Ligand binder design. Structure first.
Ligand SMILES: CSC[C@H]1O[C@@H](n2cnc3c(N)ncnc32)[C@H](O)[C@@H]1O
Ligand SMILES: CSC[C@H]1O[C@@H](n2cnc3c(N)ncnc32)[C@H](O)[C@@H]1O
Ligand SMILES: CSC[C@H]1O[C@@H](n2cnc3c(N)ncnc32)[C@H](O)[C@@H]1O
Lengths: 286, 284, 289
């Protein structure tokens, strides 16, 4: 049976997705998650919410315990994780107030625990080399886009639609993220180099969250909230929080509809393949 | 009033900038600085100098306590930091013996403490997300450039001048650095990749020093010394003589830059520096 | 005079290279190596082999003690290190089953000890800034290439041969590697970005091994084994552990043949000046002295 975990980032401290049924404080083999987990239901579908940066946003991106957050949701029997991520746009048609259902990323983070497996005592025994060519669960990506359509939110696909058909605010049907380590924002030089590489948005939290989700055998998809233009075009904290304020109502609608849409389908084969993928990536056993 | 801290890179392990008035062996919340801080004056202007690599150049770039160095200067009441940074050139017009007053960078460092704030036990409490689009203090950059002019050094600005102004040796009035972790120098493949990205010089020490200075509310500017062509493109005695001549020039730039800083009002700039820190605290 | 160390990667967790003469259980000032080191002879040349990931391949690329592996081989008197490195191809002409005698790299690793020297108690006292423009030992590179020829394996030299002269499987006489930190494989986005930078292969273990060998005054060369296309070529078999191990199975005998012949070729030459130069480069790179 399906159970959807939700990891909320900047601006999503009041998800208001369901009346809470229960509240749970857990530990994992990798430490404590960012905060208490809040439990409830969307229809018949069990749902669990946690704030990535903890209540009060005291934890910076580089210090978030991504391993504990993902493993805590796995241990509650989540089959899916939906994530929100505030980001800066590197592209003219990705405008503050738009959303992006990411399908690609380039990793520029460092110093974070990015795998559950290793040779040290605070990791699980083994060597896990996971395929990441298409790093998200494509089924769950498409459910996020379909949820946007079902809630009458514009969807823009730059492959099949002229730029003049891009009506803001819109959900972009694809996009690539560069994940930088933070906590500072990029220089103009860095922003132009990321733009020249063809990346669409920049953010501090996607990785290693997406990677650990796949290690945990979970279907993961992110909805990126464009809160600013990165400085190739000026981003600051107050600018980001103000835009997320204007966009959070849509984030809620999409996530709410997405959970219901997940629950309406059979995931048996996908889940079995998620699990089999973890086992076939163990080099120490092969 | 103003007080200018100076962080001396390679070639400045024992700077003879001013008569030593006092010395300060301090400890910061983030550990010990690279060495004792030397206090004095340039005319009327208070000044503090420390060698980034310590006496004897025993501390490699990745192990320099950038947080302690910057915070120690802040605790002494510095309003500005001037820094020197030896570098390799990535471009044909940047020649050994030239200098660069950097205005941009691309960060390839890792494993260094690059922020004063966090939830970790060895940081101050808070989440600080600093804007860094133009990461230096532009007033202080122009002062280093003017100091070079005042000491009869050629200044070349490829935005406002044609190539005829690029007469060596010259101070390049803008430039972008890639900061690598070291300690090894780049491969030819790495050098060509950085060149293709349009970067001007490569160095090991600019970041996180520039980042932490802005976190500390301080105006910061770097004068980079071109010591070599990086290996995209040489007896040691000639290299050392040329570096020696470059150090004389940089010493003159720094002393003149301190006097230039002391001659202007910085009230509003300093208030803006501090306000940028406060408005960058997301946890508040 | 000469003694050749060998660091075996994937496919070499049990090297099986020569008759075991001595088994060394050692420690270094930087900790324990990945496994015991096996000493013996290839023909008349002394040789030492160790598995980079240890016997069970329980040590991931990010956690290998590169410093201890290299220093341990130095302490046993090695003058040379030959390394194998499994990799994915970023280029149409580098096909699974080919090998690459690397001559360049771009480093995207982090969090690994990459130098013997520093100011902390677990390093040697000093500051070493090594030049790395051409980061391999060129004589030892050419010996790997000659060893392929002596064993009737195709050699492809893009500088002197046309694209239609590339016959697979072949040893490529040059190539650039991007070293990523792992353990995950690259995304499609990352793979196309590395390809656009002109890199030839992607791998997780070359760096800092190559850098520390030069710091130790040793001649180092890597033979990269193309086990997959990296995921830019989606119309091919997508990279995974199982595919890598399967291709390595089909290639390992030829890798051993090149290694064993290269060891013999190294012993057949004089290295007095090259070793003196390796050592002098270390001393002239000390910036505390
Ligand atoms: C509160 S502003 C910083 C937070 O917003 C995100 N963010 C928004 N815009 C950007 C940007 N232009 N670059 C990087 N991260 C950004 C980051 O992931 C971070 O957690
Ligand atoms: C004492 S030599 C090492 C110093 O040289 C500087 N440097 C000079 N040239 C280069 C270069 N081409 N690449 C990197 N760093 C360099 C680095 O910042 C380092 O502190
Ligand atoms: C078992 S597959 C992963 C191992 O082989 C190497 N390898 C093979 N293919 C790749 C690839 N496409 N990218 C990165 N490393 C690879 C890595 O260095 C690692 O030790």
């Amino acid at each position: 049976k399906v159970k959807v975990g939700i990891i909320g980032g900047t601006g999503f401290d009041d998800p208001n997705l369901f009346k809470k049924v229960g509240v749970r404080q857990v530990t994992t083999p990798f430490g404590k998650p960012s905060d208490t987990l809040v439990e409830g239901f969307v229809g018949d579908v069990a749902c669990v919410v946690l704030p990535r940066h903890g209540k009060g946003h005291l934890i910076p991106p580089s210090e978030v315990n991504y391993r504990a957050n993902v493993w805590a949701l796995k241990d509650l029997g989540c089959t899916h994780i939906l994530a929100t991520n505030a980001c800066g746009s590197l592209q003219e048609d990705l405008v503050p107030g738009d959303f992006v259902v990411l399908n690609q990323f380039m990793d520029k983070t460092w110093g974070r625990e990015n795998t559950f497996y290793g040779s040290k005592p605070d990791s699980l025994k083994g060597v896990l080399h996971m395929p990441m060519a298409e790093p998200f669960c494509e089924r769950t990506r498409q459910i996020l886009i379909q949820a946007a359509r079902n809630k009458s939110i514009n969807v823009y696909d730059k492959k099949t639609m002229d730029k003049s058909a891009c009506i803001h605010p819109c959900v972009h049907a694809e996009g690539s993220a560069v994940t930088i380590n933070g906590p500072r924002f990029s220089t103009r030089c860095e922003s132009f180099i990321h733009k020249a590489m063809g990346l669409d948005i920049v953010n501090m939290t996607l990785v290693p969250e997406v990677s650990l989700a796949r290690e945990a055998g979970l279907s993961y998809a992110s909805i990126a909230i464009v809160t600013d233009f990165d400085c190739w075009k000026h981003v600051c904290v107050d600018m980001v929080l103000e835009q997320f304020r204007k966009s959070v109502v849509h984030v809620r609608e999409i996530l709410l509809e997405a959970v219901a849409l997940i629950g309406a389908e059979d995931w048996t084969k996908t889940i079995e393949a998620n699990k089999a993928l973890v086992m076939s990536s163990r080099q120490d056993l092969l």
